[PDB]
Design an enzyme around this catalytic site. Structure first.
Site, PDB file in Angstrom:
ATOM      1  N   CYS A 197       0.601  -1.620   0.255  1.00  0.00           N
ATOM      2  CA  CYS A 197      -0.034  -0.017  -0.030  1.00  0.00           C
ATOM      3  C   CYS A 197       0.700   1.328   0.205  1.00  0.00           C
ATOM      4  N   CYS A 204       2.104   3.163  -3.178  1.00  0.00           N
ATOM      5  CA  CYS A 204       2.149   4.374  -3.905  1.00  0.00           C
ATOM      6  C   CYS A 204       0.901   5.492  -3.138  1.00  0.00           C
ATOM      7  N   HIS A 205       0.910   4.993  -1.537  1.00  0.00           N
ATOM      8  CA  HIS A 205      -0.198   6.150  -0.927  1.00  0.00           C
ATOM      9  C   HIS A 205       0.913   7.015  -0.120  1.00  0.00           C
ATOM     10  N   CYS A 215      -8.256  -1.816  -5.272  1.00  0.00           N
ATOM     11  CA  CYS A 215      -6.189  -1.800  -5.427  1.00  0.00           C
ATOM     12  C   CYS A 215      -5.547  -3.243  -5.372  1.00  0.00           C
ATOM     13  N   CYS A 248     -35.108   0.767  10.481  1.00  0.00           N
ATOM     14  CA  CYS A 248     -33.810   1.485  11.245  1.00  0.00           C
ATOM     15  C   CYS A 248     -33.751   2.451  12.435  1.00  0.00           C
ATOM     16  N   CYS A 272     -36.374   2.252  15.438  1.00  0.00           N
ATOM     17  CA  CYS A 272     -35.594   1.922  16.897  1.00  0.00           C
ATOM     18  C   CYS A 272     -34.539   3.541  16.683  1.00  0.00           C
ATOM     19  N   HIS A 273     -33.535   3.458  16.156  1.00  0.00           N
ATOM     20  CA  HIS A 273     -33.179   4.627  16.431  1.00  0.00           C
ATOM     21  C   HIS A 273     -33.502   6.450  15.986  1.00  0.00           C
ATOM     22  N   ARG A 326     -22.392  -5.510  10.760  1.00  0.00           N
ATOM     23  CA  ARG A 326     -23.552  -4.441  11.430  1.00  0.00           C
ATOM     24  C   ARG A 326     -25.290  -4.777  10.870  1.00  0.00           C
ATOM     25  N   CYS A 350     -28.404  -6.203  11.990  1.00  0.00           N
ATOM     26  CA  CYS A 350     -29.334  -4.979  11.963  1.00  0.00           C
ATOM     27  C   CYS A 350     -30.803  -6.058  11.625  1.00  0.00           C
TER      28      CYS A 350
HETATM   29  C1  HEC Z   1      -3.121  -2.316   0.467  1.00  0.00           C
HETATM   30  C2  HEC Z   1      -3.693  -2.862  -0.023  1.00  0.00           C
HETATM   31  C3  HEC Z   1      -4.319  -0.585  -0.146  1.00  0.00           C
HETATM   32  C4  HEC Z   1      -4.987  -0.159   0.046  1.00  0.00           C
HETATM   33  C5  HEC Z   1      -5.448  -0.579   2.035  1.00  0.00           C
HETATM   34  C6  HEC Z   1      -5.461   1.180  -0.596  1.00  0.00           C
HETATM   35  N1  HEC Z   1      -4.488   1.330  -1.616  1.00  0.00           N
HETATM   36 FE1  HEC Z   1      -4.731   2.173  -3.384  1.00  0.00          FE
HETATM   37  N2  HEC Z   1      -4.975   3.904  -5.166  1.00  0.00           N
HETATM   38  C7  HEC Z   1      -4.311   3.695  -6.280  1.00  0.00           C
HETATM   39  C8  HEC Z   1      -4.968   4.727  -7.406  1.00  0.00           C
HETATM   40  C9  HEC Z   1      -4.486   4.426  -8.729  1.00  0.00           C
HETATM   41  C10 HEC Z   1      -5.779   4.878  -6.132  1.00  0.00           C
HETATM   42  C11 HEC Z   1      -6.934   6.003  -7.252  1.00  0.00           C
HETATM   43  C12 HEC Z   1      -7.745   5.140  -7.914  1.00  0.00           C
HETATM   44  C13 HEC Z   1      -9.551   5.441  -8.452  1.00  0.00           C
HETATM   45  O1  HEC Z   1      -9.084   6.325  -8.639  1.00  0.00           O
HETATM   46  O2  HEC Z   1     -10.513   3.681  -8.510  1.00  0.00           O
HETATM   47  C14 HEC Z   1      -6.313   4.473  -5.470  1.00  0.00           C
HETATM   48  C15 HEC Z   1      -6.830   4.221  -4.603  1.00  0.00           C
HETATM   49  C16 HEC Z   1      -7.215   3.968  -3.059  1.00  0.00           C
HETATM   50  C17 HEC Z   1      -7.964   4.546  -1.700  1.00  0.00           C
HETATM   51  C18 HEC Z   1      -9.502   5.344  -2.162  1.00  0.00           C
HETATM   52  C19 HEC Z   1      -8.170   6.947  -2.076  1.00  0.00           C
HETATM   53  C20 HEC Z   1      -9.439   8.333  -2.612  1.00  0.00           C
HETATM   54  O3  HEC Z   1      -7.948   9.059  -2.183  1.00  0.00           O
HETATM   55  O4  HEC Z   1     -10.298   8.343  -2.684  1.00  0.00           O
HETATM   56  C21 HEC Z   1      -8.330   3.772  -0.649  1.00  0.00           C
HETATM   57  C22 HEC Z   1      -8.497   3.376   0.543  1.00  0.00           C
HETATM   58  C23 HEC Z   1      -6.713   2.764  -0.697  1.00  0.00           C
HETATM   59  N3  HEC Z   1      -6.638   3.516  -2.706  1.00  0.00           N
HETATM   60  C24 HEC Z   1      -6.370   1.795   0.005  1.00  0.00           C
HETATM   61  C25 HEC Z   1      -2.265   2.961  -6.267  1.00  0.00           C
HETATM   62  C26 HEC Z   1      -2.684   2.377  -5.579  1.00  0.00           C
HETATM   63  C27 HEC Z   1      -1.350   1.267  -5.335  1.00  0.00           C
HETATM   64  C28 HEC Z   1      -0.783   1.564  -6.825  1.00  0.00           C
HETATM   65  C29 HEC Z   1       0.288   0.082  -7.940  1.00  0.00           C
HETATM   66  C30 HEC Z   1      -1.361   0.314  -4.878  1.00  0.00           C
HETATM   67  C31 HEC Z   1      -0.482  -1.168  -4.687  1.00  0.00           C
HETATM   68  C32 HEC Z   1      -2.267   0.693  -4.047  1.00  0.00           C
HETATM   69  N4  HEC Z   1      -3.536   1.475  -4.323  1.00  0.00           N
HETATM   70  C33 HEC Z   1      -2.404   0.141  -2.932  1.00  0.00           C
HETATM   71  C34 HEC Z   1      -3.700   0.387  -1.747  1.00  0.00           C
HETATM   72  C1  HEC Z   2     -34.833  -4.574  16.544  1.00  0.00           C
HETATM   73  C2  HEC Z   2     -34.453  -2.873  16.759  1.00  0.00           C
HETATM   74  C3  HEC Z   2     -32.801  -2.318  16.054  1.00  0.00           C
HETATM   75  C4  HEC Z   2     -33.360  -2.290  14.624  1.00  0.00           C
HETATM   76  C5  HEC Z   2     -34.949  -2.312  13.932  1.00  0.00           C
HETATM   77  C6  HEC Z   2     -32.427  -1.669  14.669  1.00  0.00           C
HETATM   78  N1  HEC Z   2     -31.751  -1.517  15.266  1.00  0.00           N
HETATM   79 FE1  HEC Z   2     -29.341  -0.754  15.336  1.00  0.00          FE
HETATM   80  N2  HEC Z   2     -29.206  -1.137  17.089  1.00  0.00           N
HETATM   81  C7  HEC Z   2     -30.050  -1.798  18.026  1.00  0.00           C
HETATM   82  C8  HEC Z   2     -29.308  -1.585  19.567  1.00  0.00           C
HETATM   83  C9  HEC Z   2     -30.486  -1.995  20.746  1.00  0.00           C
HETATM   84  C10 HEC Z   2     -28.589  -1.607  19.048  1.00  0.00           C
HETATM   85  C11 HEC Z   2     -26.794  -1.002  20.600  1.00  0.00           C
HETATM   86  C12 HEC Z   2     -27.152  -0.141  21.248  1.00  0.00           C
HETATM   87  C13 HEC Z   2     -27.151   1.898  20.284  1.00  0.00           C
HETATM   88  O1  HEC Z   2     -27.747   1.620  19.949  1.00  0.00           O
HETATM   89  O2  HEC Z   2     -25.470   1.654  20.245  1.00  0.00           O
HETATM   90  C14 HEC Z   2     -27.911  -1.412  17.433  1.00  0.00           C
HETATM   91  C15 HEC Z   2     -26.758  -0.114  17.283  1.00  0.00           C
HETATM   92  C16 HEC Z   2     -26.418  -0.209  15.965  1.00  0.00           C
HETATM   93  C17 HEC Z   2     -25.697   0.642  15.505  1.00  0.00           C
HETATM   94  C18 HEC Z   2     -24.004   1.329  16.339  1.00  0.00           C
HETATM   95  C19 HEC Z   2     -24.147   2.270  16.687  1.00  0.00           C
HETATM   96  C20 HEC Z   2     -22.268   2.411  17.451  1.00  0.00           C
HETATM   97  O3  HEC Z   2     -22.527   3.780  17.492  1.00  0.00           O
HETATM   98  O4  HEC Z   2     -21.654   1.760  17.275  1.00  0.00           O
HETATM   99  C21 HEC Z   2     -25.784   1.003  14.067  1.00  0.00           C
HETATM  100  C22 HEC Z   2     -24.759   0.986  12.616  1.00  0.00           C
HETATM  101  C23 HEC Z   2     -26.767   0.304  14.185  1.00  0.00           C
HETATM  102  N3  HEC Z   2     -27.434   0.027  15.324  1.00  0.00           N
HETATM  103  C24 HEC Z   2     -27.779   0.693  12.436  1.00  0.00           C
HETATM  104  C25 HEC Z   2     -29.239   0.095  12.164  1.00  0.00           C
HETATM  105  C26 HEC Z   2     -29.205  -0.234  10.886  1.00  0.00           C
HETATM  106  C27 HEC Z   2     -28.562   0.103  10.097  1.00  0.00           C
HETATM  107  C28 HEC Z   2     -30.430   0.077  11.315  1.00  0.00           C
HETATM  108  C29 HEC Z   2     -31.302  -1.169  10.045  1.00  0.00           C
HETATM  109  C30 HEC Z   2     -30.782  -1.959   9.446  1.00  0.00           C
HETATM  110  C31 HEC Z   2     -30.759  -0.702  12.196  1.00  0.00           C
HETATM  111  N4  HEC Z   2     -29.359  -0.325  12.878  1.00  0.00           N
HETATM  112  C32 HEC Z   2     -31.782  -1.239  12.782  1.00  0.00           C
HETATM  113  C33 HEC Z   2     -31.332  -2.099  17.790  1.00  0.00           C
HETATM  114  C34 HEC Z   2     -31.654  -2.094  16.505  1.00  0.00           C
END
Ligand code: HEC
Ligand code: HEC
Ligand code: HEC
Lengths: 135, 261
Positions: free
Chosen positions: B76, B79-80, B114, B177, B180-181, B218, B222
């Site tokens: 990684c 390039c990065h 990548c 979602c 509950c939330h 998650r 959910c």
């Molecule tokens: C090792 C496994 C990694 C990880 C975790 C990431 N990279 Fe790359 N990267 C490269 C190029 C040309 C791009 C642009 C691609 C495009 O536009 O489609 C990227 C992009 C990413 C991202 C998104 C970055 C952003 O600014 O939005 C991320 C999160 C990311 N990479 C992680 C180039 C390269 C390489 C060139 C040979 C190599 C090797 C890697 N990347 C490796 C990794």
């Molecule tokens: C049955 C009720 C219920 C429903 C419906 C539900 N959740 Fe939850 N969710 C919970 C409970 C309980 C927790 C743990 C306590 C909390 O909210 O941090 C939780 C936690 C989470 C968390 C973790 C928050 C954190 O801070 O880490 C995320 C993200 C989340 N829910 C997203 C969703 C999404 C997306 C959906 C729809 C797919 C959804 N929830 C539907 C009950 C529910």
């Protein structure tokens, strides 16, 4: 006998006057089903001071619900809470259609074939019997 | 408690409470980190990286960043540059529209593109330990920066798709979602204190499973816990929901990796 989910008579208020089964409601077993996440999961949302660990506060305390509501209203709330409280978050426990991506319990798998209600007729009558003692 | 300040390592100030974004102002007075909903003991685990078990994995990913992997013979870092520089700010602005894709991309999808197309390496499992630890590293170098995901322009229709999903009731328990939330944040489901379900702290280290948890992990759980069928991890649906949920916390600081129940 048993009244099937599609065969339940619900009045204009969401009240269901006739039991779902004619087998007697066990108040003792209804208490049990309310703590099981796999069945009622009532505790996750509702306080019952009588049961005596960590009840939810999404739903109101159910203490004295028999004193404020008719049995028919209580059963109705359990058949399909939405009939009694529109847009409520309370699940519908005796509904078998009209869902969106229902799965088999907490398995993430899609239900294939017919939908069984969240609770049986007997399970609802057990739970109704138990709620009726909360006076 | 909910109003106590979160400063990490004595140095990183975390905005845990913010003005509700204009798209959401209808519903909340104020948006809050999930950290503000935790016990004092759990809250403390995030106040120092030495007490934060998620950071162990962030440290291992620091090594991975510099290790050459795949047939291309590149890391990684090749390039990065240093991760602190090359990934700085990026966690704050994803998911986002990516020109080369003509689509909104998540950090994971970028990391996998990548690997496969630039590194000659095998894909990481979307929500596996390798991906989640790298995403946690990326997040961690932008902690204290405001989450600022675009909801308009080439991102809009994806944002609307995720918005639709947020308010759609799923499962045999029939819950969205928001059920509950949004409606019941600050209430208890059993022992769990309902938060606003924010993703600014992700990936979360959870005391429940003693590991890092990916956003889509998650989301999967959910929908599952409505007694429903989750969308696939990496699916257009979860990408769309992540952009939308991300937007629900615009203004909160980046906290990943965070500590939660
Ligand atoms: C090792 C496994 C990694 C990880 C975790 C990431 N990279 Fe790359 N990267 C490269 C190029 C040309 C791009 C642009 C691609 C495009 O536009 O489609 C990227 C992009 C990413 C991202 C998104 C970055 C952003 O600014 O939005 C991320 C999160 C990311 N990479 C992680 C180039 C390269 C390489 C060139 C040979 C190599 C090797 C890697 N990347 C490796 C990794
Ligand atoms: C049955 C009720 C219920 C429903 C419906 C539900 N959740 Fe939850 N969710 C919970 C409970 C309980 C927790 C743990 C306590 C909390 O909210 O941090 C939780 C936690 C989470 C968390 C973790 C928050 C954190 O801070 O880490 C995320 C993200 C989340 N829910 C997203 C969703 C999404 C997306 C959906 C729809 C797919 C959804 N929830 C539907 C009950 C529910
Ligand atoms: C997803 C949350 C949730 C679950 C699970 C749940 N309830 Fe409810 N329940 C509610 C809410 C919320 C109300 C209040 C109506 C409203 O405003 O939606 C309510 C109302 C009620 C009432 C009427 C009480 C009153 O005073 O208004 C009864 C009785 C009741 N529930 C029993 C049960 C039983 C029995 C179960 C288990 C089969 C159960 N609940 C499971 C959320 C829930």
């Amino acid at each position: 006998a048993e009244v099937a989910p599609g065969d339940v008579a619900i009045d204009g208020q969401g009240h269901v006057a006739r039991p779902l089964t004619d087998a007697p409601g066990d108040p003792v077993e209804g208490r049990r089903l309310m703590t099981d996440r796999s069945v009622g999961n009532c505790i996750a949302c509702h306080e019952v001071t009588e049961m005596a660990q960590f009840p939810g506060t999404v739903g109101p305390s159910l203490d004295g619900v028999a004193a404020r509501y008719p049995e028919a209203m209580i059963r109705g709330i359990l058949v399909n809470s939405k009939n009694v409280f529109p847009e409520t978050v309370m699940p519908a426990y005796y509904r078998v259609e009209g869902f969106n991506r229902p799965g088999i319990a907490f398995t993430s798998k899609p239900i294939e074939g017919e939908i069984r209600p969240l609770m049986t007729a007997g399970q609802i009558e057990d739970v109704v019997a138990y709620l009726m003692t909360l006076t | 408690g909910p109003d106590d300040p979160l400063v990490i390592n004595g140095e990183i100030e975390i905005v845990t409470r913010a003005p509700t974004p204009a798209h959401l102002a209808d519903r909340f007075d104020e948006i809050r980190s999930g950290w503000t909903f935790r016990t004092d003991d759990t809250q403390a685990l995030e106040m120092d990286d030495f007490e934060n078990s998620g950071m162990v994995f962030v440290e291992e990913a620091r090594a991975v960043w510099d290790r050459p992997e795949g047939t291309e013979g590149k890391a990684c870092a090749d390039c990065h540059g240093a991760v602190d520089d090359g990934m700085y700010g990026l966690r704050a602005v994803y998911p986002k529209y990516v020109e080369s894709a003509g689509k909104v991309r998540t950090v994971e999808q970028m990391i996998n593109a990548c690997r496969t197309s630039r590194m000659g390496a095998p894909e990481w499992d979307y929500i596996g330990p390798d991906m989640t630890a790298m995403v946690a590293l990326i997040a961690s170098v932008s902690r204290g920066m405001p989450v600022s995901v675009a909801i308009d322009g080439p991102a809009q229709s994806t944002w609307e798709k995720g918005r639709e999903i947020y308010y759609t009731r799923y499962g045999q328990l029939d819950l969205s979602c928001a059920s509950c939330h949004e409606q019941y944040f600050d209430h208890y489901i059993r022992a769990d204190h309902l938060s606003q379900g924010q993703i600014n702290g992700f990936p979360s280290y959870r005391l429940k499973n003693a590991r890092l948890n990916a956003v889509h992990d998650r989301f999967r759980g959910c929908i599952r816990d409505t007694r429903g069928v989750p969308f696939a991890v990496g699916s257009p649906e979860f990408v769309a929901l992540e952009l939308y949920v991300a937007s629900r916390g615009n203004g909160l600081s980046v906290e990943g990796p965070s500590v939660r129940n």
